[PDB]
Design a protein around this nucleic acid. Structure first.
Lengths: 33, 292, 159, 172, 72
RNA sequence: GGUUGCGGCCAUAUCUAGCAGAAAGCACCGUUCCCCGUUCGAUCAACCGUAGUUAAGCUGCUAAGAGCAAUACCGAGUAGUGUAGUGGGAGACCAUACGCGAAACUAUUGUGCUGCAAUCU
RNA sequence: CCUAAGGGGGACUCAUGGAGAACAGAAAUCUCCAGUAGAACAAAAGGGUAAAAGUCCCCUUGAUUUUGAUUUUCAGUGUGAA
RNA sequence: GAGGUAAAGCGAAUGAUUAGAAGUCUUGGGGUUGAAAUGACCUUAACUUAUUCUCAAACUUUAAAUAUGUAAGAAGUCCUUG
């Protein structure tokens, strides 16, 4: 079968980590301890 | 948690688009490419065949641009067709063809180019351009303007294009957008285009649906049922319409049952009027007083 | 390292006006220029073709050639102790009609209109413009306008 | 005017989007596309990673996920088949402020299709986009505009319509 | 306080003048205008500063923010 | 006067929240044989104007509305500046003479106008 | 440095935020809303650009031939560039 | 006509920057609640809203004075037509 792919609309031609993806910004997922 | 965006600074620095661009009606890129005239042809205007399709109507105007605003040369509407024998399917591809032919003949009669540039008399579906007559005035030259409408092979705008080209207007075009064009074998099938010109697709739909799904036939092609119009005789409706349009393309305005003043007075009744500065000052005072 | 490129120092001259970016209104492309017209030059930053040099930004000249999308303008430039006629090719987006013509052309017609009438009425009329003359004598009446006596005010700090 | 129970204000499903975000490219992604074709009867589309992330083990332009859009009665059928797996039990925090809603199945064989050990089992994201009539205003090319505030779909309208149409419980 | 600033003047080069302000504290209002706007309910506290009533904008919010406003 | 099509200037026209809209128009709206295009007739294409609705779009009105625009016995002839002195001052700078002259601020007012063609209770 | 990152046409809208969807979490993919450009446009900085000059798709070689005119630097010579 | 310097502005974009106030912490910790409930409470730190003090050669909506381009006719305007 044909395999269409979702087309790219964004403009970030660079290859880097996404904006606002920092460590420690998350809540404590095991806060229940 | 996040910065409110619609600030007063956002509004202050906002540059509103052009009035008819915010309306989403005019593409100024294409308008600049179309209207702008070779500067050495100083005041000779370019003519646009503006073709627009509403839900119920086809509008085909011939327009030249000026600083005060565009000026209409001639106009043809699909709702004129009942005068010429077409009452139903006023948004067909074939109704589009009829409107194009009507605007072509009407413009040519207005200019005086009727004896010369009669147009394609025997509509056969062949691709052809209005060729100039030697030692005579050149054919009226018009450029198609489809606005924001998408260009697809088989679209109705090129039906108006074909009708106008067959009517004697010199409208440059290539036949690769007409219904009946084979992309793989780059030639135009004349028979399928001819079928589309004379309502063949509508007639085929009536034939196919009548003997397969008769209830949908009764709901869809009702107006043909009450008209005793069969699938076979539709072609003659458009054929007679073409001859009638070519016989007399002049414009007959509809008789108006009221005068302009009567219409204005009637419409002014249902219009709210702005308040006086004193009135709204009184409203503010009353609100403050009732607030204690 | 001196830099003297073509568009050096045009940071503000070739900027669009505030809240006037984007597309060009089409009255620009509808105006008609004839050979001999007086036009003003103002570079539009959004059109980089047919752009004048920064010197011609704000200069006025005579159209001498009209092409498909441009006009040829004549400018006199001081080069040393004399003028040189420069012939600049400009797309019409960078060009506007000079309004100095129309006021004078109006006076040409106005002067003729007034002059021919004076002949008709058997009189004569003087057509030259006059600088503002000193004002003549006048009488100032003081009903409701008895002169107010003003005096200089004492010094006072206002912080 | 502005009658609340106008005919044209009738809420109905705009589209249903099925998403399988298999974290790799290759046999797993092709089999997920096969599952989506079986479920929807339509060829899906393969979405690529926007950026390289080492923790997730992805790079740019690697075809990671797959998804498909269904509209009309088929969307309703797939939605009811998915709601059976959720036993008609959603939560108040499954409805967006814009009146959309969605859920996720853990095993696609619970939807009611033949299980193949070679293909395996995948989870899936169902998202239902709600909308009234006249949304074409925001999508048509010419004269595109926005939708009036009263005509807008919101969370409470969607919750009420969902409960009425399905007699399901929204665990508030 | 004057003697405090007069000493500070010795740490600066140039000439400095000590001037008693006509205004109420740090507000831009003269000491009689501020009293008038205080007794007219047009000024409310905002910590170390104040906020002044505006005869502009949304009427309802203006009324809620300055409850003691004797309108004229 | 309302509406449509095409426009000119390009916020006095934009934005937010409400309310109203007779006729006509516009619109949403229905269907998939055909031309055509899609993961998807959602967009785009074609067909019906037939089954329905002014809910939305659109238009108008409301807001001590935001913004924008204009005006000023507003600030202010202030800041700044051209020219002058064997002016002041240790200097930094300042005053004066003959001229030109802002911005913010304050207040008030306003909230699209208009061209061509067609149409309408 | 680039056969596209040149040319033409078409379709689309970006950065970001919010609200949501199994694994999935601050970061994967999907959906809606807001979003005057806060993105991108080979490379410095500046300008310019939103139904585009940006992202994606279709076709291409005008990055071709002849020799003149003009602008900048300027002597109004050359070279380069336009 | 052109201009973006002086001045001005920052409860106008960019950048810099002082101080509190009211809120959200739901996507900050500490302490104290709980036999285990992230569901509170006191607190600082973060952000958001309306304010607040002070700035910019390579910031700016605005914007002078001086200096600068052009025009002020007979080689012009108008009427007719080769």
């Amino acid at each position: 079968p044909s395999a269409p792919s979702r087309e790219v609309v964004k403009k970030n031609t660079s290859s880097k980590k996404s904006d606002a993806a920092p460590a420690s910004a998350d809540p404590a997922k095991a806060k229940k301890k | 948690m996040q910065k409110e965006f619609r600030t007063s600074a956002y509004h202050s620095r906002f540059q509103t688009p052009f009035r008819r661009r915010q309306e989403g009606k005019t593409d100024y890129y294409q308008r600049k490419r179309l209207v702008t005239q070779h500067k050495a042809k100083y005041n000779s205007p370019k003519y646009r065949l503006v073709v627009r399709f509403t839900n119920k109507d086809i509008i085909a105007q011939i327009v030249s641009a000026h600083i005060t605003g565009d000026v209409v040369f001639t106009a043809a509407y699909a709702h004129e067709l009942p005068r010429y024998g077409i009452k139903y399917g006023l948004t067909n591809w074939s109704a589009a063809y009829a409107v194009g032919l009507l605007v072509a003949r009407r413009a040519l009669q207005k200019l005086g180019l009727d004896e010369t540039y009669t147009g394609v008399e025997e509509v056969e579906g062949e691709f052809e351009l209005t060729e100039a007559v030697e030692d005579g005035p050149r054919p009226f030259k018009v450029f198609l303007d489809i606005g924001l409408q998408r260009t697809t092979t088989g679209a109705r705008v090129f039906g108006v294009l074909k009708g106008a080209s067959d009517g004697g207007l010199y409208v440059p075009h290539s036949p690769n957008r007409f219904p009946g064009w084979d992309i793989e074998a780059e030639e135009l099938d004349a028979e399928l285009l001819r079928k589309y010109i004379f309502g063949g697709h509508v007639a085929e739909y009536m034939e196919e649906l009548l003997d397969d799904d008769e209830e949908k036939y009764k709901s869809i092609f009702k107006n043909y049922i009450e008209e005793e119009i069969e699938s076979e005789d539709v072609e003659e409706i458009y054929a007679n319409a073409h001859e009638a349009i070519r016989a007399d393309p002049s414009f007959k305005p509809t008789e108006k049952k009221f005068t302009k003043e009567q219409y204005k007075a009637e419409s002014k009744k249902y219009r709210q009027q702005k308040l006086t500065r004193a009135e709204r000052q009184a409203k503010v005072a009353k609100k403050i007083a009732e607030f204690k | 390292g001196k830099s003297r490129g073509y568009r050096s120092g045009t940071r503000y001259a070739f900027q669009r006006d505030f809240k006037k970016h984007g597309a060009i209104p089409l009255s620009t492309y509808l105006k008609v220029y004839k050979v001999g017209d007086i036009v003003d030059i103002k570079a539009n930053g959004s059109i980089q073709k047919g752009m004048p040099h920064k010197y011609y930004h704000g200069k006025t000249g005579i159209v001498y050639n009209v092409t498909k999308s441009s006009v040829g303008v004549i400018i006199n430039k001081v080069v040393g102790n004399r003028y040189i006629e420069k012939r600049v090719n400009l797309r019409v987006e960078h060009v506007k009609h000079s309004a100095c013509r129309q006021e004078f052309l109006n006076r040409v017609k106005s002067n003729a209109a007034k002059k021919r009438e004076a002949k008709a009425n058997g009189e004569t009329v003087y057509l030259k413009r006059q600088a503002a003359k000193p004002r003549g004598s006048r009488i100032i009446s003081t009903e409701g306008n008895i002169p107010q006596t003003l005096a200089p005010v004492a010094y006072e700090t206002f912080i | 005017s502005d009658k609340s129970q106008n005919v044209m204000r009738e809420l109905r499903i705009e589209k249903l989007v099925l998403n399988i975000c298999v974290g790799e490219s290759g046999d797993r992604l092709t089999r997920a596309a096969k599952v989506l074709e079986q479920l929807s009867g339509q060829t899906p589309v393969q979405s690529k990673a926007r950026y390289t992330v080492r923790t997730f083990g992805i790079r740019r332009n690697e075809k990671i996920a797959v998804h498909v859009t269904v509209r009309g009665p088929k969307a309703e059928e797939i939605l009811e088949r998915g709601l059976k797996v959720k036993e008609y039990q959603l939560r108040s925090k499954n409805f967006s402020a814009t009146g959309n809603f969605g859920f996720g199945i853990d095993e696609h064989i619970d939807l009611g299709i033949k299980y193949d050990p070679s293909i395996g089992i995948y989870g899936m994201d169902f998202y239902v986009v709600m909308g009234r009539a006249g949304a074409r205003v925001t999508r048509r090319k010419r004269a595109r505009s926005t939708i009036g505030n009263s005509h807008k779909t919101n969370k409470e309208d969607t919750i009420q319509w969902f409960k009425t149409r399905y007699d399901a419980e929204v665990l508030d | 306080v004057i003697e405090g600033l007069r000493r500070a003047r010795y740490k600066f080069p140039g000439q400095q003048k000590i001037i008693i302000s006509k205004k109420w504290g740090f507000t831009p209002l003269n000491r009689d205008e501020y009293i008038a706007k205080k007794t007219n309910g047009e000024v409310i506290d905002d910590g170390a500063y104040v906020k002044f009533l505006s005869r502009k904008g949304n009427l309802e919010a203006n009324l809620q923010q300055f409850p003691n406003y004797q309108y004229s």
